């Protein structure tokens, strides 16, 4: 089913998807928990959250834009989390077999890619720590041409 909501203001919101819908939401949302067990698709345009917890299982597409103080993503298989533009002060991102996540952490970033998984950090957090288990990858995916591309510091330099 296709859902199109234009204008939402909440201090808490919970979304659980068990099928394959196409739901897009507009406004400001204090999203807290997000659960996906099917091949669903969801989008939020502006979110102002304090602690987001995303758990995606099977071929679920998620897109969120806004600010988050503490984001925790767990992708399991074929799950896409287009979390770019969602600047999380603290990021806890874990990806499992053949899943893709895009993160834009700001202050502290902690990532783990287990096997055949991908994490792409489009922002240079003040401190970063990424781990790879079998074949998982954590890449930078920055432009290299931005006139103000910040370089790694003594506290940023992690060598994969």
């Amino acid at each position: 089913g296709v859902t199109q909501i234009n204008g939402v203001s909440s201090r808490n919101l919970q979304i659980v998807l068990k099928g394959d819908p196409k739901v897009l939401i507009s406004g400001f949302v204090n999203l807290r928990q997000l659960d996906m067990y099917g091949k669903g698709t969801l989008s939020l345009y502006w979110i102002k959250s304090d602690t987001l917890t995303i758990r995606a299982k099977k071929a679920a597409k998620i897109q969120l834009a806004g600010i988050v103080n503490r984001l925790d993503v767990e992708l399991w298989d074929f799950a896409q989390f287009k979390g770019k533009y969602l600047r999380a002060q603290r990021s806890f991102v874990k990806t499992h077999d053949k899943s893709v996540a895009e993160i834009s952490a700001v202050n502290h970033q902690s990532s783990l890619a287990t096997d055949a998984s991908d994490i792409y950090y489009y922002n240079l957090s003040k401190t970063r720590a990424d781990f790879m288990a079998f074949n998982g990858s954590v890449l930078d995916m920055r432009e290299w041409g931005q006139s103000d591309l910040k370089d790694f510091d003594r506290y940023n330099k992690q060598f994969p």
Binding site: W144, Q146, S147, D148, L149, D151, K157
Partner: protein, 139 residues
């Protein structure tokens, strides 16, 4: 048994005296940097004169203790930028010593320019792919 975690290798009193002197120098230098920064804070960043671009984001780990021109020329060649020199190189060489580890060529050029200071200045024109070192008009 009883133990405490830092069980390092043996150290020599030569290294110990050097460590104490180095810490004293570091404290004096911190005080000096703080007082001068408070006296007159910086107003302009050299990223204007050395704007980064593609192929300036290639990285390099440098350990150099010689004159500025050769290091700048090697950096430019590795960046595929034509190297140009302005001004008369002074009789007293503009020595620099850059000891970094895996940092981009734009950052290395910025470090070289800052270390040169009033003696030499590095500019980068990415439109013309030119790295230009100019020795100041002293003398």
């Amino acid at each position: 048994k009883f133990k405490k975690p830092p069980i390092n290798n043996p150290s020599d009193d030569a290294t110990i005296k050097l460590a104490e002197a180095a810490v004293s120098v570091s404290d004096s230098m911190l005080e000096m940097a703080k007082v001068e920064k408070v006296i007159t804070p910086p107003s302009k960043d050299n990223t204007l004169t050395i704007p980064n671009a593609y192929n300036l984001q290639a990285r390099a780990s440098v350990d150099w203790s010689g004159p500025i021109e050769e290091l700048t020329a090697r950096i430019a060649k590795a960046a595929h930028f034509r190297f140009r020199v302005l001004g008369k190189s002074p009789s007293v060489p503009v020595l620099i010593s850059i000891s970094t580890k895996d940092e981009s060529l734009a950052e290395i050029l910025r470090d070289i320019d800052y270390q040169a200071g009033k003696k030499a200045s590095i500019h980068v024109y990415p439109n013309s792919q030119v790295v230009e070192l100019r020795y100041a008009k002293i003398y």
